[PDB]
Subunit: 228 residues, 4 copies
């Protein structure tokens, strides 16, 4: 339960977004919410979604842009002045990258995949950590089994998610000095539901999970266990 | 109230410092009804007193080395509940001599005991009690330790047992899924318990190395156990969750 | 050749299709001298015949469930060789009943037997034979399977045993490194892309892992499985 | 030798302390014919002299950040060999500043460079050179580090890179298997190289104290493992990460 907690939600595009399921569970559990939208064409839907949860706090943020990350800090500084939770649900590679195999990955497509899907977590964490000072905050990100095993056609995203899980470990080391935690949910195809992810996110971002950091929790109906 | 209307069997309570006591405490807070085993006749008194403190009258002797004790446990729960939601498996033992040198010095008999009590008991309890869980959204949780994954000097045969335990969890998840049940492990960091050679140094080293510079508590385990045994974790099975203040991340 | 001047004990040969036979074959090719255990009297004839074909007359009965058989094996090696370089541990068993149903159906006695034969035997052999390896920089190799890591239906208690075995390899690596020795596991795919491997695949990997070329490798599990382990399907 | 009649491309030699030099040395002992890349014009002389020492006249400049250099590398190998058995990928870089604090302090540009040079280069080289391996039983080996799996302070963005690299190896194994080829990683322990950074001495000391042998690995340990992994003895081994680290990876206390 997240009473008194202020959470930033990234990655809401619509009502089927994994981040929507997280926001839904967070709202139920008493969290106040703020949202990013990735592009201008998503602003209307994200604003409506935020309003449906009683939030008017919506800000444009292209995570490939340093200036947008700094602007996000400023927006949160001005409207809240502190922060408890970051939900990082941002993953992208150009669609061409999923055709063929990893062997067919373009250099630019690789750069884009890593920057959006992995570096964005570092940039958000660095920039927003000051807002969390003295709060014992929590960050959660999303991964997939393709990080650990070959899922054909997942391609560069399997590489990105392996990098992401390592990033979670290093960031856990960094931010523990300031009292904060960061974990990943390795989600099955959304099969699980977005609500399965959301309820797991609530726990991991709650004080009940105070001893859990740098962990990857599989929310996948046990898919990960199978050897055949 | 995440466990409202849930019935949970708690194994492994010896005293108020036991990991299972932490689990009972969190489960109680969250609305679970509790039943307890005690391992040896000497523990009866304090386990009954502990149960009473949680509003439970259900305490029964169960030495998991004994097939008849497991059967009688089932009979006891059939009479007093007739359905079951949760099994907390917090049982680990090896003769103390097995911790003195290295794994190379493990005795055959000590090995057999360690695996039987620390691993096989999970299989026996799961098989025996599964019928009582029918129609329920059952959850089982067991306790492991990082010594399953890496070498922790003096943990020895228990590092072998815990690796077997985590594999056992995976196979059991596969078995019990078709009955609508889940099973997971909590890989807990060191806690100063009655149950837990070289402990002081292990505890000190772990505390120094983990990113928080502090040990976990039995309450940390309990709160994680609540989640994993609740319907919020309906999509989580065969998983090992580290409740260790980040110790598992370090490559120093 | 890679194993010249090295003396290797081979456990687990039952016949020419035994994984240990492939290891013995590769070991022989590479110049190792060989000694064999046989598990039961009814296997003596075939094992002696196999040993002879490799130019060995060093064959000894060893039921690894028996402490006295393990002590006796040390004596046999002390008498005939007086030193040792390599142990090949290829010993895994559970009563056939245990592979019916799932792990949930495992009997207590079947579990005890599986762990004792498949896992504890490695500890007992390593402890007992380590003195013979003194000052040689020895190497031990054991066998595992992907069912240690992931669920392979019907592998059951052996999946538990193999997970325990791999952990045992790590702890033993820690123990024996201070005496200059190494121990590793080969996680073999099913035996003769992600297709069945051969006993020769295992054998040539065993030679490397038990050679001085692998001097920096210990407590490792090497998958010899045509890449099966990578798949998330 | 185990590599008799095999032709191997060696990337990443800067001097005789380089991990790739150890690999070249073992490969040479074992009968491989060698070709070398050098990363920058300043390394040319050094790498040509090292190649000469192994009886090789095949050295070519290849900056892996450049698509045209990878294309020209292929053209060079087509002209001088026309077939290829082995690629040794020993390429890792991030700007020095990235090792100074924690991963939290990583710059966007330093991250991009690290991933491009340390990870993407493997994909580029594998894709470009695979045709030269057609009909051969090819093998590729790359170098990783335990920082891919666990937190090694100050290894930072390289620990992210190496985790991506190990995943890249798995996916490439899947891709190249249908052409009869294999690819593996050696997760090597610390070695004092030109390339190996903030806190190196302490990392080296700590690793040496903690590993069960109480000593670091050598470039020759890596070389001998690479020979096996790139030989037909390892025909059944692909997508694997092999720790060549004197047992460091087993330790759960430090």
């Amino acid at each position: 339960l997240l009473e008194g907690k202020r959470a930033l939600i990234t990655g809401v595009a619509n009502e089927r977004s994994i981040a929507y399921g997280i926001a839904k569970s967070f709202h139920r559990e008493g969290a106040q919410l703020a949202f990013t939208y990735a592009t201008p064409k998503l602003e209307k839907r994200v604003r409506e979604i935020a309003k449906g949860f009683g939030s008017d706090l919506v800000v444009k943020c292209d995570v490939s842009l340093d200036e947008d990350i700094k602007n996000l800090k400023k927006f949160l500084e001005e409207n809240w002045g502190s922060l408890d939770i970051i939900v990082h649900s941002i993953a992208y590679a150009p669609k061409e990258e999923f055709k063929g195999g990893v062997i067919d990955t373009s250099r630019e497509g690789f750069k884009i995949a890593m920057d959006i899907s992995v570096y964005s977590l570092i940039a958000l964490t660095r920039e927003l950590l000051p807002l969390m000072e003295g709060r014992n905050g929590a960050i959660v990100t999303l991964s997939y089994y393709g990080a650990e095993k070959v899922v054909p056609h997942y391609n560069v995203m399997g590489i990105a998610k392996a990098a992401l899980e390592s990033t979670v470990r290093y960031l856990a080391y960094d931010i523990a000095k300031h009292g904060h935690r960061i974990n990943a949910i390795s989600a099955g195809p959304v099969p699980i539901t977005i609500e399965d992810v959301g309820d797991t996110a609530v726990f991991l971002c709650s004080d009940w999970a105070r001893a859990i950091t740098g962990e990857v929790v599989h929310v996948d109906n046990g898919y990960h266990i199978m050897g055949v």
